[PDB]
């Protein structure tokens, strides 16, 4: 009978909502008062990229923090060099509509996805003077919104069909599926140890999954709209979320409850990209007001304004070593800040 | 390190040449988005002219790049932002479509689209498909009681051999769509209702694209 299950879920949810608040103690604000504010951070753009045509949707840095891969809606996946500004590779994509791109940690492979429902893997080891698609990971019902590389073989992707999948290149078959989401998954991020990943969906819920056995360890709620971005706090025990309610909320895996909120009255636009720095003191969050903001964590005081883009900041990434931050907008322009 | 720099510069020049050629090719093509309901019967219209079934057709030697929604979820809140730079959005609605009120859902979809912040600079073309089924089912006041008191517009030019009621119904629907489109202020996006069933759809969409680009140019030159 449905009534018994509904009632059991109701009381169990009320119990968990009571347990969280009853266990809440410091609340972060009182404990982190002592730390000194970081102050104003007036960073300046160092490199400007103007080789693209259409609006940028995604980008991924490299382990060496020297080469980056970017994707556009005109069908071009261009690998840029952050030092010499010269282009390295330009693979003409079969499908113009792409919404995500990933760079392998070893740098040998690059992946992309979008509205074509197929994940394409490209190899940078040229054998005949041209680069073609190696294997296509077809099978997803909905549009692919994000993709990341666990290693040179295992690739985890999130799609719009309210589920996430893990794929193997050599066989092209699904290994582990992650189901239970009711809203569309927008992005996924990998932990430094790659043991667990958090996927944000459109139902204002973030779920932590085990890449191997695929069970939802925890579910985080509290957002007032759809989650668009996800990041992992360097430590590995926490993560931050961004939604359209013009606020950023930080969640802790061990606390299972929300820890900090980054909201302001002036900002009303949505948030599309949330990333952290190497130390994790700073949170760089994009916004729909045609510029980016640098939110200082642990205090909620604004540290800088990245007002250098002419359109909405679709994506924002940071280097592995933490030396530069790259921001992408809808003006087909890429900027490097340091 | 000089030789590697020279090789990288040569590769950059080659990539720039390729990007230039691709750029010029890309700008010639006009991108269009096709939208409709389940009963809209857009497959028949496509025949008249995979996640997305892209189609290619040339009219007057101008190449158009029109996309189909295809196998996708009914939730259009997220992925609709990707089509904000297209030349126009073709909206096909079955006027005859009853088991359920499809007209109200289409009206709400048009209202949500028209007032989207990202899509407020993208003109929408409205097509009223399945006119013959409407004529057969007529030969509406339950869903729209205002149709009973509605009168034919003085500027209506019905084709010969058509009974008045179907003309006054299609005109009522067109007026309703125009009123909901113009209920708010419209900037850089317009509405062009049309009647389709018809091999002239390519000419109609070509004329709409022409008019759109003309008015866009005028708006940059602040003439209109």
């Amino acid at each position, epitope marked *: 009978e449905l009534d018994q299950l509904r009632q059991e879920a109701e009381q169990l949810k009320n119990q968990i909502r009571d347990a969280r608040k009853a266990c809440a103690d410091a609340t972060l604000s009182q404990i982190t008062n002592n730390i000194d504010p970081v102050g104003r951070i007036q960073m300046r753009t160092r490199r400007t990229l103007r080789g693209h045509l259409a609006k940028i949707y995604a980008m991924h840095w490299g382990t060496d923090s020297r080469l980056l891969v970017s994707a556009s809606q005109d069908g071009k996946l261009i690998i840029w060099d952050s030092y010499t500004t010269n282009k390295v590779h330009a693979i003409p994509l079969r499908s113009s509509w792409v919404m995500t791109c990933a760079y392998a940690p070893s740098g040998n492979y690059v992946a992309c996805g979008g509205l074509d429902n197929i994940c394409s893997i490209y190899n940078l080891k040229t054998r005949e003077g041209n680069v073609r698609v190696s294997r296509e990971l077809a099978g997803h019902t909905g549009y692919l919104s994000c993709c990341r590389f666990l290693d040179d073989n295992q690739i985890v992707t999130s799609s719009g069909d309210t589920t996430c999948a893990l794929w193997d290149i050599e066989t092209g078959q699904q290994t582990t599926t992650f189901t239970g989401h*009711t*809203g569309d998954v927008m992005s996924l991020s990998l932990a430094p140890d790659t043991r667990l990943f958090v996927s944000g969906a*459109c*139902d*204002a*819920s973030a779920k932590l999954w085990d890449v191997r056995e695929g069970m939802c360890r925890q579910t985080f*709620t509290g957002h*007032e*709209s*759809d989650i668009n971005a996800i990041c992992f706090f360097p430590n590995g025990n926490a993560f931050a979320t961004g939604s*359209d*309610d013009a606020t950023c909320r930080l969640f802790d895996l061990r606390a299972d409850q929300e820890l900090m909120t980054y909201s302001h009255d002036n900002i*009303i636009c*949505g948030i599309t990209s949330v990333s952290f720095s190497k130390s994790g003191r700073l949170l760089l969050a994009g916004y729909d007001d045609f510029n980016c903001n640098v939110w200082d964590a642990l205090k909620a005081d604004r540290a800088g304004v990245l007002a250098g883009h002419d359109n909405r900041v679709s994506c924002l990434g940071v280097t592995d070593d933490g030396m530069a931050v790259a921001t992408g907008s809808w003006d087909s322009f890429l900027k490097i800040w340091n | 390190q000089r030789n590697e720099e020279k090789a990288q510069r040569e590769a950059n020049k080659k990539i720039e040449k390729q990007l230039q050629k691709d750029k010029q090719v890309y700008r010639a093509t006009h991108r269009l988005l096709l939208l409709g309901a389940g009963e809209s019967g857009k497959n028949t219209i496509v025949k008249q002219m995979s996640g997305i079934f892209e189609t290619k057709f040339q009219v007057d030697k101008v190449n158009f790049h029109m996309f189909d929604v295809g196998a996708q979820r*009914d*939730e*259009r*809140r997220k992925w*609709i932002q990707c089509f904000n730079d297209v030349t126009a959005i073709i909206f096909v609605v079955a006027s005859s479509s009853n*088991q*359920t*009120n499809r007209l*109200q*859902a289409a009206l*709400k979809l048009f*209202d*949500s*689209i*028209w*007032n*989207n*912040k990202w899509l407020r600079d993208t003109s929408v073309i409205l097509f009223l498909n399945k006119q013959d089924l409407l004529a057969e089912k007529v030969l509406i006041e*339950d*869903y*729209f*009681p*205002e149709f009973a008191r509605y009168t034919t517009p003085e500027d209506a030019t019905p084709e010969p051999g058509e009974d008045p009621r179907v003309t006054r119904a299609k005109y009522f629907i067109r007026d309703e769509f125009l009123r909901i489109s113009t209920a*708010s202020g419209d900037g850089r996006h317009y509405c062009y209702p049309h009647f389709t069933c018809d091999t002239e759809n390519i000419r109609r969409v070509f004329n709409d694209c022409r008019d759109i680009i003309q008015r866009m140019h005028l708006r940059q030159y602040e003439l209109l």
Partner: nanobody
Amino acid sequence: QVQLQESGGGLVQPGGSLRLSCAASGFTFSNYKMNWVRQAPGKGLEWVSDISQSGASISYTGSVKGRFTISRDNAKNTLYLQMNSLKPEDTAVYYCARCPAPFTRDCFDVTSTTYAYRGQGTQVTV
């Protein structure tokens, strides 16, 4: 997670009055737009009525114009739907749903199935 639990309903004779309360919680009521959607037995979700953020602009579907009415009380953070009169085409399940984004008039995927921000619903009979 936000909830949109409903109160009221039951079995009444035709022509009766039924006050339906939607007790939304967990979010700012004022910022969002509350929309009423009805699911007929065996039919898909159908839009019924909606109310703006401040209530200045109110809209109804053609079938229920005049017969029904809505009222918003920001202080109590709840929505109401007063059915003055009832017709045989009304026996269905009523859902109070929320507009996906705040501070925007446009609402997307309100009538779509498996929508997250939908209430449990109530049973009305004529």
